[PDB]
Structures are given as structure tokens and as C-alpha cells.
Symmetry: C3
Subunit: 127 residues, 3 copies
């Protein structure tokens, strides 16, 4: 087991690590749309969706793996009315990374997220 | 890793795959109560719980595994007040498949689900 | 695979097991803050958080592993306004167990939890 840490994902400010490498599998903590360079969250959902995805990417890359190694993700959103926009950003993100296939996924609307963000994404990648 | 696909589960009409086979473990995407042949969702929760479970079963079976190979399920519901009905159907489904033991499970009521369905279920199975 | 059972975690009263041991990984069912000795749930969120964590620990210990082997946990809460208290208890718990590092984590506010509890936690541990 190895702790994953990267300055390209929001700093772990609390009792948790950004992600963990189990050897054959990598698990990331749920990533909120905080910009790692400023500590701020963009106002619009499209930008938040892309920021969370970029954060997931940073944690996965810290293990030496790539976006294409992601096999499952869970997407928690604050409002499914924005699902069209989130899916568009989400699909485009994987397309832009030239992945062989999209990962398996679960998506649900929650009552609230940390810092009142509109989305949180956790992922599983395999080596 | 291998992509899982079956006509017995709702077609992936978004940026995701039905499930993934990691060799030792199989992970399904969250399955909603859509009838794969008609694209329709039954009106009552008992029927929806049944359809989602059948969908999960289809994805797991696509890997060559069975319902008895499921080790963990996460059940997201729209209403814990229907938990009596959901719990009945859930237990019945596993009993009908003559499993040695029920899987580990987490159940929570979410704020909303894709397509305004009443339940979404994701599963982990092992070979 | 092996079924995990312990009298130190709430009794599985339904179609599920407390946890499962897959050999290299242990998965616990979501643990609610029920005190296994009395069957009661404490009123305050701090007590509930510690009770759920102790229940998770009990399931993990039933496999032969320890708190230090926990690598990922998902924390579902009924109210994020109680998150300062939950993080406090959560960090204190791992600190008291002298873990080398905190595990990866995802935290979201749900609409409702079984028995109307304020927190539910599920964990993954590795051997
Ligand atoms: Ca496009
Ligand atoms: Ca709602
Ligand atoms: Mg109701």
C-alpha cells in the first residue's frame, strides 16, 4: 500500500489522503471541483465537472497510471437538472484522453456536498 | 481488463459501459429499473427493484459469473419508506437464486436518481 | 470468499451479511451507529460517528485485519452542518489507532439513512 500525493489535486486538508495505490488497483478519494492552484471553486457546473475530473486524473497519474486505466467511477451530483451538461463534459473528458473505453459508472443526486459544490467524483483504476 | 456487454441489460446510451471484468473481480455500473427490451420503467417500486436486480444479474452473467458470486451491493433508493418492499424483493431475489449467503450491502436514500427512477443498484462480484 | 460475523457489530437483521473477506481485500456493509450491546442509537452525532467507526472496526477485526489496514471509506451523513464534529471524531479515531496514514475517503450528505441515523460508513481493507 502506498499513499498517493500530488500538488495537481486539491490538498488533503483533513483526516484523509488523496488516493491509495494497492499494487493492482488504485482508489481515489472523492474529488470536489476545487482548483488546486487557488483553492477556489468555479461557479458553473461545466467548469466544476471538468475540474473534478482533472483532479481525479491528477490522483490517478500520481500512481503512474493514466486516465485510460480508470475502470469505474461514482459521480455524486447536487442537481440532476445539470446531468446533460455533466455527461457532455464527462464524455468529452474521456474522448480527449483517447481512452479505449469509458469506465463503468454510477451516478446519483445527493442532498449536499462538501463546500456546497455541485459534483464529487471518486474513481477506481487498475494496473 | 474486459468490457462487459449484454442485450439483457439496458444499452449504454451515455459515456459508460455496462460493467467491467478485472479478472478476479467484476464491477457493474449502477443499474436503474429500465426494461432493456422496451426502454420503459415500471411504475411501482416492487417492479423497479425487480428490474434493477435483473439488470445487475445480466451484467454479472455477461462475465461468466452468477448471482451467487456477488459479494457487495450498494442500493441507492428514492425512499426508505419503501424499504420494506425493496428489502422483501431484494431478499426474495437472492433466495430464488439459491445463494449460500447474502452479499455485503449499503443502503441509502438519495435526493434523486437518473430518469427519476426509485432505485439504482451497483454490484461487485468475484471469480 | 468468506462471510464475516461478529457480536461486536450490529446484528445483520435482513438479507445481507456484516462483511465479506475476499482474501486480499475485506469489504464491510454500511455500518449505522447502533450499539451492539444495547441495540440503541446515541442521540448526538459525535457519539453516532464513533459508534459507526467502532462497528466498522469490529467487522474489519473479524477478518483478522486491523484499523490500520483500512484503505478507503465512504461516509454518508444526514447533515453536512455536522461535518466539523464528524471529521473531529473521524480523525481522532484513526489517530488513537496509531495508523501510518489516513485512508482515502468520500463524504456526501444523503436524504435519509436506515433507522433515521445521522451517519453510515462502509470500508475497504486490504491484507
Ligand atoms: Ca463530443
Ligand atoms: Ca429530491
Ligand atoms: Mg415514503
Amino acid at each position: 500500500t502506498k499513499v498517493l500525493h500530488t500538488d495537481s489535486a486539491p490538498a488533503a486538508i483533513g483526516p484523509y489522503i488523496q488516493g491509495v495505490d494497492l499494487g493492482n488497483m488504485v482508489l481515489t478519494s472523492g474529488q470536489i471541483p476545487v482548483n488546486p492552484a487557488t483553492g477556489e471553486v468555479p461557479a458553473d457546473i461545466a467548469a466544476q465537472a471538468r475540474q473534478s475530473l482533472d483532479n481525479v486524473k491528477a490522483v490517478v497519474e500520481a500512481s503512474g497510471l493514466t486516465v485510460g486505466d480508470i475502470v469505474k467511477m461514482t459521480v455524486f451530483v447536487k442537481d440532476l437538472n445539470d446531468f446533460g451538461t455533466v455527461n457532455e463534459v464527462y464524455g468529452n473528458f474521456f474522448d480527449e484522453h483517447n481512452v479505449a473505453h469509458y469506465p463503468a459508472r454510477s451516478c446519483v443526486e445527493v442532498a449536499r456536498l462538501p463546500k456546497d459544490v455541485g459534483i464529487e467524483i471518486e474513481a477506481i483504476a487498475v494496473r
